């Protein structure tokens, strides 16, 4: 998995 913003990437 997740970004620094906690999005799945």
């Amino acid at each position, epitope marked *: 998995t997740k970004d*620094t*913003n906690n*999005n799945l990437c």
Partner: antibody
Framework: EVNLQQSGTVLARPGASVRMSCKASGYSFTSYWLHWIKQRPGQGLEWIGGIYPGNRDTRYTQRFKDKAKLTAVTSANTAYMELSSLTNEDSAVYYC??????????????WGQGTTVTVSS | DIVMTQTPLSLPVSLGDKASISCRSSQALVHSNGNTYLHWYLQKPGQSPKLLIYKVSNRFSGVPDRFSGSGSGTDFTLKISRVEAEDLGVFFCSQSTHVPRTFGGGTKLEIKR
């Protein structure tokens, strides 16, 4: 569930440094990034950086690159932010924040009460 | 820093009326995972921001239906179908699909009586 407790008001002297905390509960402290944001009396909101307690990996913006230091003691679900060489611009309120939107049955977006810092002599 | 521009900056309204806040970003907010992480917050004086709508059109738990969200790519709108007296404060649109996560300057909603 899920709340963030931030340390209380802090009075600091110019050139000095302050260490403030944010204790979390309600979610897996070691599986999401935790953010810190600054807000001046008049101004809007600005993101300082974040930390991934799981592996202590951090992230900052060029501005706070040498102004802020982030750490976290996972055995206590607590995070820390340290501001060095204080000035009048450092005087503001700081919030730790958690957001997460990829699981519908568990949407997160919470803020500590914020920690108001006053830099004065 | 993908810039967020809100307009208007001040919003005079009378109870019952409808209101609209426009939010625009310097770059697309469509993340590679496919979602668009544009959100709207409301901050009463003396408190931390409170989420109203996440991912452009999703109302957060406990937020009145009077609030709606629309937008695509770079152009986004927050709508207050009916303005009560609680809606007092400053509204912020925000982006979290890019790093750093940014906020708009905000729109202070003023009531006319």
């Amino acid at each position: 569930e899920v709340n963030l407790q931030q340390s209380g008001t802090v009075l600091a002297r110019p050139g000095a440094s302050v260490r403030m905390s944010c204790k979390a509960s309600g979610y897996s402290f070691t599986s999401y990034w935790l953010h810190w944001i600054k807000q001046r009396p008049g101004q809007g909101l600005e993101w300082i950086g974040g930390i991934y307690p799981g592996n202590r990996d951090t992230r900052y913006t060029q501005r706070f690159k040498d102004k802020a230091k982030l750490t976290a003691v996972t055995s206590a679900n607590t995070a820390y932010m340290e501001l060095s060489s204080l000035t009048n611009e450092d005087s503001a309120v700081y919030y730790c924040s958690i957001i997460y939107f990829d699981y519908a049955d568990f949407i997160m977006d919470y803020w500590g009460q914020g920690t108001t810092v006053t830099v004065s002599s | 820093d993908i810039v967020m521009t809100q307009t208007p900056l001040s919003l005079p309204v009378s109870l019952g009326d409808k209101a609209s806040i426009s939010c625009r970003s310097s770059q697309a907010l469509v993340h590679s995972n496919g979602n668009t992480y544009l959100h709207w917050y409301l901050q009463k004086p003396g408190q931390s921001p409170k989420l109203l709508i996440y991912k452009v059109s999703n109302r957060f738990s406990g937020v009145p239906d009077r609030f709606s969200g629309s937008g695509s790519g770079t152009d986004f709108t927050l709508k207050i179908s009916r303005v009560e007296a609680e809606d007092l404060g400053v509204f912020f649109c925000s982006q979290s699909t890019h790093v750093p996560r940014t906020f708009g300057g905000g729109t202070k909603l003023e009531i006319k009586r």
